[PDB]
Amino acid sequence: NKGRIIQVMGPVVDIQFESGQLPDIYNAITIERPQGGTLTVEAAVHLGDNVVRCVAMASTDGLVRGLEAVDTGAPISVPVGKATLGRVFNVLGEPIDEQGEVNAEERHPIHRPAPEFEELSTADEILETGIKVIDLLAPYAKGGKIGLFGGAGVGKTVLIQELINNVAQEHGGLSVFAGVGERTREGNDLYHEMKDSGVISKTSMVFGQMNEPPGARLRVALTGLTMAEYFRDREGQDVLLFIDNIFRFTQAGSEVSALLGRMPSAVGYQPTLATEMGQLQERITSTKKGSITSIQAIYVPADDYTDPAPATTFAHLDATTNLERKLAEMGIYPAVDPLASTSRILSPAVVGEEHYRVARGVQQVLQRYNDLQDIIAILGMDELSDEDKLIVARARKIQRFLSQPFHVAEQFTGMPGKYVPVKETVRGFKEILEGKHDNLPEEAFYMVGTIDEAVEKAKKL
Amino acid sequence: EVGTVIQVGDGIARVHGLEKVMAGELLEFENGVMGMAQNLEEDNVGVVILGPYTEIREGTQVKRTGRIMEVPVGEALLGRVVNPLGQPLDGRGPIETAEYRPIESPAPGVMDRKSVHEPLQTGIKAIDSMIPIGRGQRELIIGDRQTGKTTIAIDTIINQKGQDVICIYVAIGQKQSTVAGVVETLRQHDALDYTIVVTASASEPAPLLYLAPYAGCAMGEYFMYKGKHALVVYDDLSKQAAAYRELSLLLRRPPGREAYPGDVFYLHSRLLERAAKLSDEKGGGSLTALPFIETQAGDVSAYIPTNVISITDGQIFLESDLFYSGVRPAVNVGISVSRVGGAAQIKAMKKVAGTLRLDLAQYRELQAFAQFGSDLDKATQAKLNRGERTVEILKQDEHKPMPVEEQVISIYAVTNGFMDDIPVEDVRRFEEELLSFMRANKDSLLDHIRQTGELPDTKELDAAIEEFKKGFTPS
Amino acid sequence: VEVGTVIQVGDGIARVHGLEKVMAGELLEFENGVMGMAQNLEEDNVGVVILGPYTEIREGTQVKRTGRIMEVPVGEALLGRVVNPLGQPLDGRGPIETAEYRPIESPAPGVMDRKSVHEPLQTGIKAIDSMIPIGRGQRELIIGDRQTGKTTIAIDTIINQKGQDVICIYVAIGQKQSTVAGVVETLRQHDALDYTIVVTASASEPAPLLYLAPYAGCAMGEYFMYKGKHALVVYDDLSKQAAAYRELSLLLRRPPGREAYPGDVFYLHSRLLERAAKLSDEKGGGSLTALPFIETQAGDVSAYIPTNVISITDGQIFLESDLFYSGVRPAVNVGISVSRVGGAAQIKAMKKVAGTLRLDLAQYRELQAFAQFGSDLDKATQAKLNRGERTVEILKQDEHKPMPVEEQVISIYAVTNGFMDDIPVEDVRRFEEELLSFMRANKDSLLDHIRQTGELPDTKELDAAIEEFKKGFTP
Ligand SMILES: Nc1ncnc2c1ncn2[C@@H]1O[C@H](COP(=O)(O)OP(=O)(O)O)[C@@H](O)[C@H]1O
Ligand SMILES: Nc1ncnc2c1ncn2[C@@H]1O[C@H](COP(=O)(O)OP(=O)(O)O)[C@@H](O)[C@H]1O
């Protein structure tokens, strides 16, 4: 199924085919380079006169008009299943870790409709992470999207690895990391970081790096998602898809829209902003066979949450995890802001009546303590009422009991990590609020798992 | 009556042939996917594809259907989940119906209507008392994401159980998981058998999101023009407008404010004018509309929100600060309004609620200066104490609609001072305990209201509440 | 050769018939010896961007293929020379004697060819080396308005590589040529020119040379990286490069987007900056460190090109006018500026002492509101303000006066452990200068410990030596 290159204009290639045999939109098309190697290219527009405008997935330098181009007959198709685990891929599904070929039985196409209405889970289900702060105050939901805020050096990668570990240990689900505009240096660091913590073997990795053309960065997330879809649909797993950064997916969309000549929408974004996002996001969902939970780092241009990029991304989020440097500097790890983090499924309907009551109780105490921080610093502790002094006491214990040693820090801290189930997290914080541990010293609650381990640590002090 | 595709991109195709095609005609592509003739040019046709378009290319063939853009209609849709073309998504097989209705259709003219006078009870105290909706009204539900908009419409549909009102939930641009959740919630409250569900999920091509509200409108119109009463929910028109912008920009139509086309107002105005209350001569039927707008950071002065505000007969604004502080439903009393008003209310409710909105608007303003407990003058002290209690009454749990007769008693109780000696934290339990008492023991009073629509004898009612009070233990 | 003929010419672009077999990006020669580059391979012409005078090119002029992608001369012959992006000498000191060439476009080191950045690139600027540390293989953006001190940071950084065995490349895109002559002269006087290559596409040059200038400099530095040596490249600035590539893209009628830039303007910078890296031990251990520049307008860091380059690099140094004019020079916003590599690019001594500087200034910046309330404040916050103003004075630093890291560690150690708390704020900078001349002359065994081990000396010996100096200091 053959074609001739008629035009080359940056990362856009116009290819002429013969009358009856024009590739479908989104089909992969290969061109053998004169210099050696293959350039893969994705069909975008049917211009007429049997021409297709296509978006390149690598450099078009060195191409010549009149070269042969071959329709592969389907979209970009990518390895799935157990052969992907522990490996590092590019957008095309080719391995880039220099560990030879990937002997996978199947290759699935990266473009695909969203799951049918009949296939959908019809009730919100909590995804237990084993991490106290998250499970209690801003729980992750099985079908759902989670927005991961936090700057440099607050614990993003450590947290993402611990989630890979704890989904793998206890629910037996796998993970995929999609680096959308990954910086090559930081891909290399993340590979070695995951190899050392051992989480690598539970995770497929896909990098569409900052130096690749827009097409690559636009579609690399779909490559990762396609791998996760296998583990959901054909091994009934609860799967984690990590995307860093989902803004760069939207930005690559606007870059490619510009080169296709499309009229811009509000704030210069592509007119297909919402639909392009929906085609990615709606595939991340819980079906009857299993679940994909997505955990997405989200850039906010000009600090403006009303900007079309984050505004459209926000419509799909179920939860947020706000990492704050202030907490990291105090030694509270994971450094999750227990007031700023939120979840749509922290409601009595989904977690129990008790869970909700406890979580709101915890947040009330923390909020009050936060309000008194200024008053305490100046007027001192004698100025507070007896009710407030008791709240400050508990707030400080609560704040420490939200910290937790991670399995993936076992090498660095030298202390064993802890998985704490939801039942135990709720029980622990319930008891602190009730006053059952007002006589334990504060250090007892710091870096422990269950409430029982805090009682045990008190004896050692 | 065939044509061939000359050019395609982004779900828009130019087609050679189809010489005899109508403007707005439904077309079928070679692979079963439908389309719509939009532009009749000198020797080609502009066609918008209404479904998956990867398998459509240059050379694909297109058949006319000889039918203007239409949806299947009638009783066969009740309890079914369909897309904007009327194709069943729930996997319970075909939609057996002989009646169709066109997606674009003229609105009832100036002489075909009657003033709205019949209640549509939402079952939500805050709404039915302060922002009353009537049959034939268009009432905008507007607010940020996660302020409780969808739950208002779901609760309203549920409360139409046994009121002989056909409901249509149109889901434009939502996540499909959410839509699956909605149908399941309706099933469990036994509200699905009188409800049609139209859905253009976020992954669907823009033209389906564009058409979804018009399809739902036609489905409800059918019942209106046969003298029955319907309710349509568009959740939401923000995403529909964005989809129509995508479409307009792909056709290179000049952008204006926020890149929307000039006719984006017309998009919503034609839709919402088709909802109405018909005259006695035209059968007396009604179509009531609840369009949704999703604001960004509470900006009600943005382009699309102002358009839809200027179209509808009032709005219910939901505010984030109220929502996250535990005032749910989170109705901003100052901004919200019903242009129909007391006309859409039973006389009992119009009496007890008369000044309720203005009373709470004054409460919320005066609440800023409430730090002076015991120091503040006794007039304002009492107003704040009455206010906190009425706020507690207007809080209301999700999926728990209240009959009108029970709302009138509860609002009567608090507004005539019967909870002034009760702790603020006990007010909500006092209400629940009061109504179970009224149902079990004083049903003759409740029944008066359901039959006459009037308050019972105020002396009998005062006595009955004070009777209940003597068996109530505070904390 | 096959030849081609020029159809149209204007504004440094020609459209050429023929040349059927030409490659995208191929070098072409016009009849009169002027070179060009094939940019757009169109259905019935080739778009060719002219790399020289274009007045003598007309309709009919003939164009020959060369069969070659762009290359530039490379190696040790370029050191101390001033060249254009084609490698031709502009300083008028005759030819560049070199047998080695290298292609201007070249693939970046892949994911497996690298090692985590771990080796310092000392700028000699306290503010940077302590708070925003740069490492060998890092890309660190220098961003700020005009006249905020960006070029002087890079010039001082180059000067500080004297005797560090680091080859420097200053790429000057779009500058006035007099300014570039001024830069080379400043380097000459500080004896930094003999290890520095200077690439220059002045403002009068055709746009394609401004476009290529950074890639030429990159290749010149890559040569040293791939032989296991260490290089530093400065692009001053990428704002003007992007504008030049826009001019070119618009003349070739490639569709404009935000601020009229093409869709691939991000790709333009991302290819460039990813070629700077730290190689693995297997690939020779060499490095190319990059300092790209962005010139903001009115401090708008959210503009299109600035956001692109911020999202590419491994951190940024933001410079502000308000800081500059208040006497904080270099005018580094320490709070907002960032090194994503961090402590990995710092000797252990500096990582230790800088730990406390950061926490001291973070507390200072929070408490700064309370500085007009002098002596009303409690003694804890008073001391935090006094420590803060003193550390600010330490981070001020004269132009063209880089400091060795061993002297920085002592100076930062002094102020962060309280040794300047007794001294007037106006005396702090002289105290530092007098302290270090004392340490060099008398206590060099302590300084040398740091140069050899990279660790702090024994704190008791160090405290004594500073307190010894203090007794001979007069305010
Ligand atoms: N849970 C934790 N326990 C102990 N130390 C942690 C934890 N999380 C992060 N850190 C420390 O902070 C450093 C930076 O965290 P990192 O995961 O690299 O953040 P980011 O991904 O934002 O760069 C880690 O290398 C580690 O020293
Ligand atoms: N009256 C209420 N009581 C308790 N929870 C509510 C109430 N109304 C809404 N919610 C909760 O708030 C969340 C958001 O409400 P929803 O109606 O979906 O808002 P929107 O449709 O504007 O996003 C839902 O998940 C729901 O559980």
Ligand SMILES: Nc1ncnc2c1ncn2[C@@H]1O[C@H](COP(=O)(O)OP(=O)(O)O)[C@@H](O)[C@H]1O
């Ligand atoms: N650290 C400094 N201390 C004093 N003067 C400086 C300093 N840095 C730059 N200058 C002066 O300030 C001006 C800024 O010039 P330059 O370094 O070229 O900044 P830019 O490149 O942002 O325009 C020059 O006149 C220079 O002499």
Ligand SMILES: [Mg+2]
């Ligand atoms: Mg909703």
Ligand SMILES: [Mg+2]
């Ligand atoms: Mg400068």
